[PDB]
Amino acid sequence: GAMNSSNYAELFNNDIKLFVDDTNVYRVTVHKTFEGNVATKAINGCIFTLNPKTGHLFLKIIHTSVWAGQKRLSQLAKWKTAEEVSALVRSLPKEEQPKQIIVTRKAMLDPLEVHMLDFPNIAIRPTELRLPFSAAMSIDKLSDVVMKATEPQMVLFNIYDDWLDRISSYTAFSRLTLLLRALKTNEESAKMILLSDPTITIKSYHLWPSFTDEQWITIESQMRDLILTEYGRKYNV
Amino acid sequence: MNTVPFTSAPIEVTIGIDQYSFNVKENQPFHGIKDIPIGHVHVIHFQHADNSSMRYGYWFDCRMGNFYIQYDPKDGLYKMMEERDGAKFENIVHNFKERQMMVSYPKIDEDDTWYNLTEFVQMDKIRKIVRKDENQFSYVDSSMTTVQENELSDPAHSLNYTVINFKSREAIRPGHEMEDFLDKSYYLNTVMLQGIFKNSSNYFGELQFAFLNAMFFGNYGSSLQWHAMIELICSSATVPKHMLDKLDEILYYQIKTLPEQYSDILLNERVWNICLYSSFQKNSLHNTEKIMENKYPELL
């Protein structure tokens, strides 16, 4: 059934699994019209499909053209997400296909189940985890490839850069969720923490800066402080 | 007007005939039911006074043979049997009638309730759902599972209702996933009506049979089937006008007949709220919505 704190190590076992987050698929700016009504303008979005063990990110860029002349877009967005995940699975060799797909939002369950009927042995699961994958568009290089897209495109990243050379997947996922939680809570302050020291750069082939093990501990501390500071501000506690 | 004589009533039992019921005491001179209306299926059903576990009964049509009930002290149930000797049967029935040892099927002349519950139900379709081809009547009880319940265990004692599953390849055309899931018209009209049932009469017959097994036996699988067939129609944007008008009539009489004290176990809140208030057909079931709102406003 549902994935929670009780079965957390399951993410890092040897059964191929993907998280699917649909929160950035349908994105809009709301604005006033000349007549003083309100209208939306879609911008490019993305499906965030992540192997938590390997760090492999299948970023399917959703170009605004996919919404043209469609109705009920927030509903269609879930079905288009399911379509594209189904297509990705069918494109993978059998030995690379997931055994489980975990959706970050329960509204994705029926659409993904219906699109994957041909894969009865792939389990579709919700999670009780509150995962900050909505903040993926706060990673500059992922935001850049989405906003520049002029057509539908799939881009493959490793969201852990080279971390798995030095740390386990459990630790790499813990670092990724803390970074994204911080970016979600106070984007400006998080990016300041990540980039404030010019001597530490982002490799052309990476998403995050090239921190030494000691620098990652300092960074991780500053991120936890940011999240506690912001929590003290929200609740005045 | 036909007769189902009883050999005897050796155990205290509540006897149902269609929507009617009579209490018979242990060794009471009860010898059956006369004046049964020709032209309809009927159900004769039983609940023992000393063990209310297992309601059970027999669907039959007196046009197909001469049927009687005889208690089996080994298997501990009232069994239906067919008498092949016409003259023996006629002679038994005449004697019991002469001695007034039979209850009369108590039909009020104004009252179309049974016709209205069984309009599309045909003995030949019952015998394909309930498979026991050596008998012309069909045994059903409280505990019998459906083919669909058995997929999710003795196949011979199963109710072979048509399997309906909204998240199945049968229900969903490759390439029309969202369309077919949110609008079940394809599944209703092409797969089920054109494909399996051949026409709306056979679909309604199964729907009506499922309701009656749910109501008279508390058969849980039957209740699931009745709701699934209602939900398939209500979840279809494209349904023939005559089917919606007929469905409204079918459901009205089912809701009218349902004992008020059983609504909590026989009616699925989700399905009824969806069908009446959210579905494509939310505005197509005037009679049903009115009786449901006046009789069962708590459920909604």
Task: Report the CATH number at residue B156.
Answer: 1.25.40.550
Substitution target from B170, B172, B181, B187 for chain A, most A beta carbons within 10 A? B181
B101 and B194 inside one domain: no
All domains of chain A in start order, with CATH = 9-163 (3.30.420.230), 164-237 (1.20.80.40)
B153 and B287 inside one domain: yes
CA B194 – CA B60 distance, rounded (Å) = 28
User: Which residue matches tokens 């002290």?
Assistant: B73
DSSP 8-state class, residue B86: H
CA B223 – CA B228 distance, rounded (Å) = 9
B287 and B153 inside one domain: yes
CA distance A166 to chain B (A): 44
- Pairwise CB contact (< 8 Å): B169 & A117: yes
B151 and B300 inside one domain: yes
- Pairwise CB contact (< 8 Å): A82 & B172: no
CA A63 – CA A41 distance, rounded (Å) = 13
Out of B143, B158, B189, pick the residue that ends a domain: B143
Residue in A with minimal Cα distance to B165: A114
A/B interface, count of CB pairs below 8 Å:
24
B84 and B195 inside one domain: no
B136 and B33 inside one domain: yes
With helix as H, strand as E and coil as C, how does B138-205 read? EEEECCCCEHHHHHCCCHHHCECCCCCCCCCCCCCCCCCHHHHHHCCHHHHHHHHHHHHHCCHHHHHH
Out of B109, B143, B177, pick the residue that ends a domain: B143
B171 and B299 inside one domain: yes
Q: Which residues have a Cβ under 8 Å from the Cβ of B195 and sit 6 or more positions away?
A: none
Please check whether residue B123 is in contact with residue B98, taking contact to mean a CB–CB distance below 8 angstroms.
no
Interior/surface letters B72-100, b for 16+ CB within 10 angstroms, e for the rest: eeeeebbebbebeeeeebeebbeebbeee
- Pairwise CB contact (< 8 Å): B169 & A118: yes
Classify strands B56-60 and B42-48 as parallel, antiparallel or unpaired: antiparallel
**What's the domain range around B177?**
144-300
CA B46 – CA B55 distance, rounded (Å) = 6
Q: How far, CA to CA in Å, does A133 sit from each of A28, A46, A223, B216?
A: 18, 11, 16, 53
CA distance B170 to chain A (A): 10
Q: Is A82 on the interface with B (CB under 8 A)?
A: yes
CA distance A79 to chain B (A): 6
CATH number of the domain within which B8 lies: 2.60.34.20
Residues in chain B: 300
Please check whether residue A184 is in contact with residue A232, taking contact to mean a CB–CB distance below 8 angstroms.
no
| Residues facing residue A3 across a β-bridge | A127
DSSP 8-state class, residue B6: B
B135 and B149 inside one domain: no
Please check whether residue B258 is in contact with residue B266, taking contact to mean a CB–CB distance below 8 angstroms.
yes
| CA angle (B237 as vertex; B231, B238 as ends), nearest 5 | 105
What single string gives the DSSP state of each residue in chain A?
--B-GGGGGGGGSSS-EEEEE-TTTSEEEEEE-TTS-EEEEEE-EEEEEE-TTT-EEEEEEE-GGGGTT-SSHHHHHHHHHHHHHHHHHHHS-GGGS-SEEEESSGGGHHHHHHHTTT-TTSEEE-BS----GGGGGGSHHHHHHHHH-SS-EEEEEETTTTGGGTS-HHHHHHHHHHHHHHHHH-HHHHHHHHHS-TTS-B-TT-SSB---HHHHHHHHHHHHHHHHHHHHHHTT-
Residues of A in contact with B174 (CB under 8 A): 118
B40 and B3 inside one domain: yes
B285 and B202 inside one domain: yes
B118 and B203 inside one domain: no
Tell me the structure's resolution in angstroms, rounded to a single decimal. Answer: 1.6
Q: Is B194 on the interface with A (CB under 8 A)?
A: no
CA B281 – CA B273 distance, rounded (Å) = 12
B286 and B262 inside one domain: yes
CA B200 – CA B206 distance, rounded (Å) = 10
Show which of residues 132-171 on chain A sit within 8 Å of chain B, judged by CB atoms: none
Residues of A in contact with B178 (CB under 8 A): 76, 79, 111, 114
The number of distinct structural domains making up chain B is 2
Give the pair of three-digit tokens for residue B66.
């001469």
CA distance A9 to chain B (A): 30
Out of B113, B143, B173, pick the residue that ends a domain: B143
CA B57 – CA B78 distance, rounded (Å) = 9
State which approach was used to obtain the coordinates: X-ray
Q: Is B184 on the interface with A (CB under 8 A)?
A: no
Give the pair of three-digit tokens for residue A219.
């960074």
CA distance B190 to chain A (A): 19
Classify strands B13-17 and B20-24 as parallel, antiparallel or unpaired: antiparallel
Residues of A in contact with B181 (CB under 8 A): 110-111, 114
